[PDB]
Design a protein around this ligand. Structure first.
Ligand SMILES: [Zn+2]
Lengths: 282, 8
């Protein structure tokens, strides 16, 4: 029927506390890591390197990279990033896990901050892959190894083969990893809520995940702007039943949502403790 | 095309 009593953060929180809401899926994008100093390269002034390119997405297009990996690589030296430490949103997703609410987190992001926030591979679908690993492109390497190669401004080449080595990312025009489809196809039969945070839903098939959700399943967007509207979402029409849109920074929305669940305090302590810990290892 | 990353 209509599981939200109110199309609001207040309504969602209230729903999250009911016994009906057990399995939560988070769909997240570049918008949940920018406060961690990771610039959303899809919604860029950010590029400014020639390296003459027909358009930014070209450097991430797989054909182009294989012939001209340089634009991609000069970038990735430009965003270090100095050191990685995850956001309130990230740590929100951790509390979900800890509280037995996190069915799965599907990320478009390649920073691996979900992991550093305490989320284990079981909990996680790295839809577009990781930097952690890298392979010889020749279908016949660790972070540094590679990290060093990137900061030396020389392109990654295979020890054995001398062919290009790319990080284990899904480039555009590459197929997404298996796990993604097997996971989507049963997660989305079980899901009670959808948190969509920090994403514009301009990448496929990732963004088509919001339409796998059951008709009854409410969906909350925490994004700077509205997105995925039409199966598509419906926040404002008179027909609207299941969808809620909170506009602002991700970190702010997660603190708000957390306040209504009575977790703000725990979350803030958690971010603090974990960031202090990270510094220690320096 | 199939099911692999593709922008807008
Ligand atoms: Zn090789």
């Amino acid at each position: 029927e209509r599981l939200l009593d109110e199309l609001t953060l207040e309504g969602v929180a209230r729903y999250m506390q009911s016994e009906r809401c057990r399995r939560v899926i988070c769909l997240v994008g570049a918008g949940i890591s920018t406060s961690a100093g990771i610039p959303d390269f899809r919604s860029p002034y950010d590029n400014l390197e020639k390296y003459h390119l027909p358009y930014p997405e070209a450097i991430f297009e797989i054909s182009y990279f294989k012939k001209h990996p340089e634009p991609f690589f000069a970038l990735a030296k430009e965003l270090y990033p100095g050191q990685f430490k995850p956001t309130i949103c990230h740590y929100f997703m951790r509390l979900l896990k800890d509280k037995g609410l996190l069915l799965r987190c599907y990320t478009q992001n390649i920073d691996t901050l979900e992991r550093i926030a305490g989320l284990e591979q079981e909990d996680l679908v790295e839809a577009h892959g990781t930097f952690y690993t890298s392979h010889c492109v020749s279908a016949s390497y660790p972070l540094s190894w590679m990290k060093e190669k990137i900061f030396s401004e020389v392109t990654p080449k295979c020890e054995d083969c001398q062919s290009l080595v790319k990080p284990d990312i899904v480039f555009f025009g590459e197929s997404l990893p298996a796990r993604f489809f097997s996971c989507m196809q049963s997660d989305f039969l079980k899901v009670d809520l959808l948190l969509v945070m920090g994403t514009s839903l301009q990448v496929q098939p990732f963004a088509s995940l919001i339409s796998k959700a059951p008709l009854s399943t409410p969906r909350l967007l925490i994004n700077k702007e509205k997105a995925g509207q039409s199966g598509g979402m419906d926040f404002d029409s008179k027909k609207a039943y299941r969808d809620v849109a909170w506009l602002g920074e991700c970190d702010q929305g997660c603190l708000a949502l957390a306040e209504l669940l009575g977790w703000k305090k725990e979350l803030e302590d958690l971010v603090r403790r974990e960031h202090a810990s990270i510094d220690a290892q320096s | 095309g199939e099911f692999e990353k593709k922008y807008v």
